[PDB]
Symmetry: C2
Subunit: 110 residues, 2 copies
Amino acid sequence: LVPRGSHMNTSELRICRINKESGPCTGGEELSLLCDKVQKEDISVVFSTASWEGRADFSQADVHRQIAIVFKTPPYEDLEISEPVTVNVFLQRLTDGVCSEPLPFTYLPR
Amino acid sequence: LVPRGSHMNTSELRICRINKESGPCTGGEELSLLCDKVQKEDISVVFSTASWEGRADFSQADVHRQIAIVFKTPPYEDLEISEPVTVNVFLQRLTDGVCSEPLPFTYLPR
């Protein structure tokens, strides 16, 4: 817990990043951010300068728990394709081999 | 559990979306996807067509648990700004009022 202006900052709460770094001063714009552990029923997002403060609007229903997988794509079978080829991408559990529905991903020519 | 080709699909595992919908047939490209509950030590990502199959490469360390907050930005104090104004964006817990470090976000003129 460290003093910052009139409030108390902590290393517990943390914003990893905001999807868009700018937008209209008009507001009312829909954005999303990624953060570490927060309790949906006990959290808020604030916009401020030294003298002004504005709160974003959202609900517990807008706090989404998700999972991201960063990975390297495998190369396509044919490297000499001259036209875009769109394949299937899906998840598979190793233990029982069960899979998820697929999602399209299209390989592009060299 | 439903039959799909030579494997078994389930509604348990699910890919919400892939950050990029296309890329070089060369592969080796780094991507990331969002999915529902998966066990990092028991999961994989597969690329395939009816006759071909390729696996993405990643580790347990590449399976990130995160939280996304979708929200509406508040309008800036001054709507008649003629130059970009970049403010602070931070999280604040309602119960104890503790905040997170800020991240920049710049409001744009009308």
